[PDB]
Design a protein around this ligand. Structure first.
Ligand SMILES: *[C@@H]1O[C@H](CO)[C@@H](O[C@@H]2O[C@H](CO)[C@@H](O[C@@H]3O[C@H](CO[C@H]4O[C@H](CO)[C@@H](O)[C@H](O)[C@@H]4O)[C@@H](O)[C@H](O[C@H]4O[C@H](CO)[C@@H](O)[C@H](O)[C@@H]4O)[C@@H]3O[C@H]3OC[C@@H](O)[C@H](O)[C@H]3O)[C@H](O)[C@H]2NC(C)=O)[C@H](O[C@@H]2O[C@@H](C)[C@@H](O)[C@@H](O)[C@@H]2O)[C@H]1NC(C)=O
Ligand SMILES: *[C@@H]1O[C@H](CO)[C@@H](O[C@@H]2O[C@H](CO)[C@@H](O[C@@H]3O[C@H](CO[C@H]4O[C@H](CO)[C@@H](O)[C@H](O)[C@@H]4O)[C@@H](O)[C@H](O[C@H]4O[C@H](CO)[C@@H](O)[C@H](O)[C@@H]4O)[C@@H]3O[C@H]3OC[C@@H](O)[C@H](O)[C@H]3O)[C@H](O)[C@H]2NC(C)=O)[C@H](O[C@@H]2O[C@@H](C)[C@@H](O)[C@@H](O)[C@@H]2O)[C@H]1NC(C)=O
Ligand code: HEM
Ligand code: HEM
Ligand SMILES: *[C@@H]1O[C@H](CO)[C@@H](O[C@@H]2O[C@H](CO)[C@@H](O)[C@H](O)[C@H]2NC(C)=O)[C@H](O[C@@H]2O[C@@H](C)[C@@H](O)[C@@H](O)[C@@H]2O)[C@H]1NC(C)=O
Ligand SMILES: *[C@@H]1O[C@H](CO)[C@@H](O[C@@H]2O[C@H](CO)[C@@H](O)[C@H](O)[C@H]2NC(C)=O)[C@H](O[C@@H]2O[C@@H](C)[C@@H](O)[C@@H](O)[C@@H]2O)[C@H]1NC(C)=O
Ligand SMILES: *[C@@H]1O[C@H](CO)[C@@H](O[C@@H]2O[C@H](CO)[C@@H](O)[C@H](O)[C@H]2NC(C)=O)[C@H](O[C@@H]2O[C@@H](C)[C@@H](O)[C@@H](O)[C@@H]2O)[C@H]1NC(C)=O
Ligand SMILES: *[C@@H]1O[C@H](CO)[C@@H](O[C@@H]2O[C@H](CO)[C@@H](O)[C@H](O)[C@H]2NC(C)=O)[C@H](O[C@@H]2O[C@@H](C)[C@@H](O)[C@@H](O)[C@@H]2O)[C@H]1NC(C)=O
Ligand SMILES: *[C@@H]1O[C@H](CO)[C@@H](O)[C@H](O[C@@H]2O[C@@H](C)[C@@H](O)[C@@H](O)[C@@H]2O)[C@H]1NC(C)=O
Ligand SMILES: *[C@@H]1O[C@H](CO)[C@@H](O)[C@H](O[C@@H]2O[C@@H](C)[C@@H](O)[C@@H](O)[C@@H]2O)[C@H]1NC(C)=O
Ligand SMILES: *[C@@H]1O[C@H](CO)[C@@H](O)[C@H](O)[C@H]1NC(C)=O
Ligand SMILES: *[C@@H]1O[C@H](CO)[C@@H](O)[C@H](O)[C@H]1NC(C)=O
Ligand SMILES: *[C@@H]1O[C@H](CO)[C@@H](O)[C@H](O)[C@H]1NC(C)=O
Ligand SMILES: *[C@@H]1O[C@H](CO)[C@@H](O)[C@H](O)[C@H]1NC(C)=O
Ligand SMILES: *[C@H]1O[C@H](CO)[C@@H](O)[C@H](O)[C@H]1NC(C)=O
Ligand SMILES: *[C@H]1O[C@H](CO)[C@@H](O)[C@H](O)[C@H]1NC(C)=O
Ligand SMILES: [Ca+2]
Ligand SMILES: [Ca+2]
Ligand SMILES: [Ca+2]
Ligand SMILES: [Ca+2]
Ligand SMILES: [Cl-]
Ligand SMILES: [Cl-]
Ligand SMILES: [Cl-]
Ligand SMILES: [Cl-]
Ligand SMILES: [Cl-]
Ligand SMILES: [Cl-]
Lengths: 306, 306
């Protein structure tokens, strides 16, 4: 249904145009590739990869940007507006915001040293957003491994997809508030999570003091913070996962995910192969095609009023 | 004048007693060895190693604890009170607070994996403190290399002493406010200090955002944050010094300190030898002997009133 050749006639250069805007954005924000792929994920899981997260509040829309997993966390929306502007300059009224987020995810990976792959295209933009569904279905960093598997299975993604796509935390940032439960009073025990390397526990206690600003951020990958590579996995082997849901892929007793982690730690090309296949799968969740929905002129609004 | 045998008759076990209290304190604070040696340094440079920093405010004392280099920064005072209590239990009215800080510095180094050495003893406690002199003579983390040399030379410490004793930043913590000038607007240039490794610049920008809490802390030694070792020096070789005054020992054009840094990076035993000799020198600054001055019963007060 989707196809990488979808714009071969109507906007032949679209992927180069998207790439060029992100290359420009990287001149002022080294974090932008990570934030963009996160926007694609947070779109896909909420009624499908349909641009829904990009809509702002209006008379009829309650934006997903203020759902708990997005509020004061999701970012890159002005850079998305810049990608859309550049694409509308070359090919007006052709390329949906849902597809711009998909291309931007892939180019963000490749520009960060990760794999490239042909991006299936042909998605359309939704007219609706659903903040309550975003609260419900976007996984929390406090989920257990079995709960993470369930959350992914509800989207049609399996255990391999969970491990491979969690490797997107090979770059990017996380605020104290998303892991500080591991530092002082883990699972109501009164003590730190023992699956955190003690040196990392001390590092994180330094920057996330118990009464402090829970918005302060650290690198999700303490080893190669911007490079898209397999160091996320080898970090888990030494208990250097930052989120509880990162370390659980390795440290959970009797988990089948442990072997996948150790494989991807030892074989970056195996990780990259799985990560591509999983991204394509994630990119095909709940998509609007034919027509269904529309091609927005402005990613933040439906075409016409509210 | 001072001698390691000063208490051999009057308090034969004093160094073991001090060691045992710090070993106990380490059960609840991994940072305590670093904070204690810093207190010894901040005592020595202000009218000499005479306990002056330990006095609290009174009718007659304006405490050095609120001098800019100490205020909301110096710490470990309750642990010092605990050392004094333990020593007064075994040997009442014998061991000065000035000597307790000297022994505590040395034992803090050895317990952290550093060298041990025989500690010259026989110092007495001052009746006075001088907050203005502490503001003037304690070196700022914004000094240039030539200004650091001058500051040390004013205390009788030479270029080797500067480099060796700066190695005490092989452990311990520094707040954002003491290096964040390197991150955004360095020396009025509007740009970051280019002698900061770019990966460390990104790490430090994450935790010290430009309008944020300047009290947040990071490790002075990003490689071995608690181990007393030569990694402080090898960090400078890769531009991983946290304070401006750390990186300048390596990166300053035409500095004679560069060779000392590279030597200590390659030869931890050479660092340890120099560090011992420098500590003994620092420990002999401005000391009261015979007593002159007194042996306090309580480190925070002069004996008797105010
Ligand atoms: C924005 O997203 C939110 C979150 O998704 C949407 O609200 C959710 O909407 C779903 C429907 O899509 C609601 O689920 C349904 O709830 C019915 C009532 O359930 C209660 O009562 C049952 C006893 O009667 C009890 O068994 C339940 O546990 C519960 O206490 C269910 O009858 C219904 O089940 C039947 O239909 C489903 C198909 O959807 C079918 O699969 C079943 O087998 C049944 O025949 C359904 O239950 C579901 O629960 C979630 C999963 O656990 C299950 O797999 C599902 O079956 C849901 O309650 C609601 N949540 C909230 C928090 O409101 C919201 O939808 C709209 O607004 C809500 C209020 C409602 O009016 C919906 O119908 C609207 O579509 C989205 N907003 C918009 C604008 O679309
Ligand atoms: C707590 O610590 C503070 C900080 O150290 C103490 O205050 C400092 O006290 C010193 C004296 O110890 C003062 O320095 C002296 O200042 C005199 C005046 O200087 C001014 O005027 C000069 C022209 O007359 C001009 O040349 C100066 O640059 C300045 O503008 C100087 O005359 C004096 O120099 C002579 O004596 C010294 C010996 O101390 C000798 O070496 C010289 O060659 C001279 O013959 C001296 O100057 C010094 O400046 C610092 C260095 O640059 C030099 O190496 C020194 O020579 C200093 O001004 C003062 N600082 C402040 C901020 O107040 C404080 O001391 C007490 O309180 C002060 C107010 C004063 O009354 C002192 O005499 C007190 O001892 C300490 N508090 C306590 C309770 O002890
Ligand atoms: C597996 C379950 C997942 C959980 C529980 C989770 C949770 C989180 C949390 C809490 C943060 C920190 C947000 C912030 O502080 O800004 C974050 C950041 C991130 N997430 Fe995940 N996430 C998961 C899966 C994924 C997936 C599937 C991807 C993409 C394929 C992804 C990509 C990212 C990226 C790149 C960042 C950094 C974003 C930035 O720097 O702006 N995550 N995630
Ligand atoms: C050479 C000039 C020096 C400068 C400019 C300097 C400056 C600083 C600064 C700004 C901090 C951070 C304070 C805080 O945030 O708590 C600090 C911490 C420290 N200093 Fe230095 N210092 C110097 C020399 C020394 C010396 C000579 C020693 C001891 C021999 C020392 C031992 C320490 C230790 C161990 C810490 C960490 C303290 C803690 O974790 O509580 N410093 N120093
Ligand atoms: C998760 O879904 C994947 C499909 O995206 C599964 O991999 C696929 O396995 C098929 C056989 O079941 C095979 O035809 C496909 O070539 C293959 N696709 C890719 C991209 O690898 C995956 O299955 C696991 O991994 C593969 C390599 C095999 O070893 C299977 O035996 C594994 O179960 C699915 N993962 C799970 C946990 O089911
Ligand atoms: C906590 O992180 C430390 C720093 O990465 C880990 O130490 C390193 O682990 C490697 C084994 O996977 C080993 O080759 C390195 O020599 C070692 N490096 C250093 C500087 O210690 C640490 O691993 C534990 O402690 C070390 C001393 C070894 O005994 C390992 O066997 C331990 O796993 C990490 N801790 C954990 C629980 O992963
Ligand atoms: C800083 O003071 C040190 C004394 O604590 C000097 O080292 C000492 O040098 C003496 C000859 O000048 C010698 O008798 C001492 O044994 C020696 N003490 C120690 C502990 O090393 C130091 O001099 C420098 O370092 C030594 C090793 C020699 O190579 C000298 O030639 C160096 O200058 C003084 N540093 C400076 C920069 O003056
Ligand atoms: C910034 O820190 C990096 C991480 O420690 C430094 O890279 C490391 O430097 C070593 C040379 O002293 C070298 O053996 C390592 O391979 C290298 N490690 C990695 C993971 O890159 C970096 O050093 C610079 O950049 C690297 C790529 C080399 O080209 C070095 O020659 C450079 O000095 C540190 N940057 C600086 C300016 O010190
Ligand atoms: C998302 O974050 C912003 C901060 O930028 C919050 O102010 C929003 O809080 C919401 O609106 C305020 C005025 C208050 O009523 C509060 O209770 C609401 O939660 C926030 N939006 C949401 C939905 O959390
Ligand atoms: C040292 O830090 C404390 C915070 O714990 C400050 O409140 C002190 O500030 C001083 O006293 C206050 C009441 C105010 O007058 C201020 O201007 C003073 O600086 C501070 N002490 C010193 C000497 O800075
Ligand atoms: C912390 O709180 C302050 C106070 O409002 C706020 O400005 C800032 O965005 C927060 N986050 C960080 C990382 O400092
Ligand atoms: C892991 O998890 C699920 C649930 O147990 C399982 O069915 C799936 O096949 C497993 N995957 C691997 C690679 O072992
Ligand atoms: C930051 O500011 C808060 C607000 O008063 C304070 O409680 C805290 O001690 C400061 N430091 C850190 C590291 O959070
Ligand atoms: C370095 O600094 C001072 C000032 O230049 C100099 O006199 C001293 O001898 C030097 N030390 C070394 C080890 O070269
Ligand atoms: C953690 O501390 C204790 C448990 O030992 C308890 O009083 C408290 O409720 C716990 N904190 C949270 C957030 O549950
Ligand atoms: C840094 O920014 C600019 C210099 O380019 C200037 O306006 C400002 O005064 C500088 N900041 C400080 C603290 O000096
Ligand atoms: Ca969506
Ligand atoms: Ca990485
Ligand atoms: Ca003193
Ligand atoms: Ca160290
Ligand atoms: Cl996420
Ligand atoms: Cl960081
Ligand atoms: Cl895709
Ligand atoms: Cl200091
Ligand atoms: Cl840290
Ligand atoms: Cl000594």
């Amino acid at each position: 249904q989707l196809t990488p050749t979808f714009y071969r006639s109507t906007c032949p250069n679209v992927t180069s145009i998207v790439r060029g805007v992100i290359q420009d954005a990287l001149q002022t924000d080294l974090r932008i590739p990570a934030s963009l792929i996160r926007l694609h994920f947070h779109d896909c899981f909420v009624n499908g990869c349909d641009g829904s997260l990009l809509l702002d509040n209006s008379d009829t829309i309650e934006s997903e940007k203020q759902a708990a997993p997005n509020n004061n966390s999701a970012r890159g929306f002005d850079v998305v507006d810049n990608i859309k502007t550049a694409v509308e300059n070359a090919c007006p009224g052709v390329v949906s915001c849902a597809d711009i987020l998909t291309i931007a995810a892939e180019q963000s990976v490749w520009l960060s040293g990760g794999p490239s792959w042909p991006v299936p295209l042909g998605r359309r933009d939704s007219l609706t957003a659903n903040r309550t569904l975003a609260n419900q279905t976007l996984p929390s960093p406090f989920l257990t491994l079995d709960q993470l598997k369930t959350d992914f299975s509800d989207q049609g993604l399996n255990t391999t997809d969970l491990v491979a796509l969690s490797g997107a935390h090979t770059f990017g940032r996380a605020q104290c508030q998303f892991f500080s439960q591991r530092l002082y009073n883990f699972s109501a025990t009164g003590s730190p999570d023992p699956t955190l390397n003690t040196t990392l526990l001390e590092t994180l206690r330094n920057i996330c003091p118990q009464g402090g600003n829970g918005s302060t951020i650290t690198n999700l990958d303490q080893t190669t913070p911007d490079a898209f590579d397999n160091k996320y996995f080898s970090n888990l082997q030494t208990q250097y996962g930052i989120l509880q849901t990162d370390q659980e892929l390795f440290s959970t007793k009797g988990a089948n995910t442990t072997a996948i982690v150790t494989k991807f730690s030892a074989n970056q090309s195996a990780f990259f192969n799985s990560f591509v296949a999983s991204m394509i799968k994630m990119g095909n969740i709940g998509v609007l095609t034919n027509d269904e929905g529309e091609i927005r002129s402005n990613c933040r609004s439906v075409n016409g009023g509210a």
